[PDB]
Amino acid sequence: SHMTIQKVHGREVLDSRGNPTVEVEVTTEKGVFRSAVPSGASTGVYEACELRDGDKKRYVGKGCLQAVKNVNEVIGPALIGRDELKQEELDTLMLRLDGTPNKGKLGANAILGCSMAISKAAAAAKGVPLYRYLASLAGTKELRLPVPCFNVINGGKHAGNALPFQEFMIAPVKATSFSEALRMGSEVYHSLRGIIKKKYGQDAVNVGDEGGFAPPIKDINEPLPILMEAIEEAGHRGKFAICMDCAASETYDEKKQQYNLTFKSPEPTWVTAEQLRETYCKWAHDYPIVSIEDPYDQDDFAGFAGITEALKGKTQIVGDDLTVTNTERIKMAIEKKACNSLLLKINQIGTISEAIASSKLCMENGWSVMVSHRSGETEDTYIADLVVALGSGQIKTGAPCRGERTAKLNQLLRIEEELGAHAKFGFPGWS
């Protein structure tokens, strides 16, 4: 009938690293609703299946023709004529079409694009913006613009440097609006570039996958003074906090049960989890570090729990690979008091309904939720709407550099403008 889904079409497009990913368009009488799927590099072993073709003759095996075929030939034909308003029903249909816990049959990258585009078609059907529609789905009482955590010095897996830990971020927590937050973040970012150029030279100011600088730094402590210097120089002393994403699993050796802090270097530097805790306690004390994500390997619940307790009320501990936006893993984390913040990645789980369920479970258990991009992004801006819709007050979506990051930041500007001067900003705990 007239208001239902008319067409569903997937296509392979490129992500911000030039790798294929999936985009889906759901067409209704209200228009064409397009959603693209991001792709991680430091993907947790428990993430929902990202289905790649493995054809060495295309994109050296990273094609998404099969996931796209799954959208075009399996999921889409199922959705035609369906009521896009029925988000849970359609997500559940898609889960059942796949029939596997990890979305390994159809691919989470086939499913998620559908889930996303359905929600956008549904928002259009309701005649509200996506963030309003998602807030209704989530039962969110109060929308808010999030404080952005800007990953401004890039390290880890496939950043061009020795730096083993992945993200050194700045967050304008004392900004009083998103507009002001974004400008401050950009201003610090610009100061930071001059600071890095002066200290490490010209060659040090090219950018990593998420638009942070990729200076030739090996030691994980070295970026922090630089961050404080840039904050100061930009004129924003006292306005900012620091967030870390260690992505510690990427450095972890399971057999040795130790972390290699020079895993991108010829010689290894094996450090224990107890040595890491010392480092994190020192970090939290020496700097305004309000968030540490994946400080330990993804199955080290005990390490996570120890640092969560140690930095309780000072520094939230964010599960990313630990939790993989998955209520099963989240329940394990709650049971162990392993962390108190969810990094919410729609493509870690693969449907909007499930991502929303994860956010609600975390918040009911008193965690914060930081909606997140992946290191492989697109021009898609869904997470801008999603973070506002969840009212979580926290987003990480890149340095204020590179279009696949600024697209989200800009969308947040647009949402902020729509919500007007009484719209809440930031994370109350950090304000």
Active site residue 120: no
Selection from its own copies, Zn ion, none that 84 binds (CB < 5 to 8 A by kind) is none
372 is in an annotated binding site: yes
Contacts with Zn ion by CB under 5 A lie at 2, 29, 42, 245, 320
CB of 28 to Zn ion, least distance (A): 9
**166, 372, 378, 394: which one binds its own copies (CB under 8 A):** 378
Q: Residue 425's beta-bridge partner residues?
A: 145
Region of 55-63, 112-120, 267-275, 348-356 interacting with its own copies (CB under 8 A): 55-63
Quick check: 162 binds its own copies (CB under 8 A)? yes
- Burial of 238 per CB tally in 10 Å (0-12, 13-18, 19+): exposed
53 known ligand binder: no
Written as one string, the DSSP assignment of 280-342 is: HHHHHHHS-EEEEE--S-TT-HHHHHHHHHHTTTTSEEEESTTTTT-HHHHHHHHHTT--SEE
Residue 216 interacts with its own copies (CB under 8 A)? Answer: yes
d(CA 295, CA 301): 11
**Is 202 a binder of its own copies (CB under 8 A)?**
yes
Helix (H, G, I), strand (E, B) or coil at 277: helix
- From 110-118, 223-231, 310-318, 400-408, span contacting its own copies (CB under 8 A): 400-408
Member of 19, 136, 177, 365 binding its own copies (CB under 8 A): 19
Q: According to the binding rule CB under 8 A, does residue 214 interact with its own copies?
A: yes
Q: Can you tell me the distance from the alpha carbon of 320 to that of 278, in angstroms, rounded to the nearest whole number?
A: 21
Q: Is 144 annotated as a binding residue?
A: no
The letter for the amino acid at 149 is: C
How many CB atoms neighbour CB 275 within 10 A?
A: 12
Torsion, CA 295, CA 402, CA 377, CA 72, rounded to 10: 180
User: Taking contact as CB under 8 A, which single stretch among the options 88-96, 158-166, 270-278, 331-339 is the one that binds its own copies?
Assistant: 158-166
Q: Give the residue with the Cβ less far from its own copies, 227 or 330.
A: 227
Active site residues: 210, 345
**Which amino acids are annotated as binding site, given as ranges?**
29, 41-42, 158, 167, 245, 293-294, 320-321, 345, 372-375, 396
